[PDB]
Write a protein that binds this ligand. Structure first.
Ligand SMILES: *[C@@H]1O[C@H](CO)[C@@H](O)[C@H](O)[C@H]1NC(C)=O
Ligand SMILES: *[C@@H]1O[C@H](CO)[C@@H](O)[C@H](O)[C@H]1NC(C)=O
Lengths: 48, 23
């Protein structure tokens, strides 16, 4: 009924009403970095 | 360096790169 990944998290599931398999891919994420000249020069920043 | 490659590496360097290999 359920599949699992190395972390024991759910990898895929079988839909309980219609028996098809759905992959579960966690929603996009990532670190956010701010690129900035010192604030003694400018308050403009770029975001990575 | 070998000018014919997509990355100008030498013959020997290519050999080295071909030997060393969530949510
Ligand atoms: C869910 O409903 C459908 C009809 O739309 C039926 O064919 C199916 O067997 C039902 N699933 C379960 C698990 O009862
Ligand atoms: C930084 O800003 C101060 C004003 O608060 C100014 O006196 C200082 O000379 C500035 N230094 C540089 C390196 O821009």
């Amino acid at each position: 009924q359920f599949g699992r990944d190395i972390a024991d998290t759910t990898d895929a599931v079988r839909d309980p009403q219609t028996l098809e398999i759905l992959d579960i891919t966690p929603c996009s994420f990532g670190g956010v970095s701010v690129i900035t000249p010192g604030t003694n020069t400018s308050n403009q920043v770029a975001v990575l | 360096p070998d000018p014919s490659k997509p990355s100008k590496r030498s013959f020997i360097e290519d050999l080295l790169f071909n030997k060393v290999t969530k949510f």
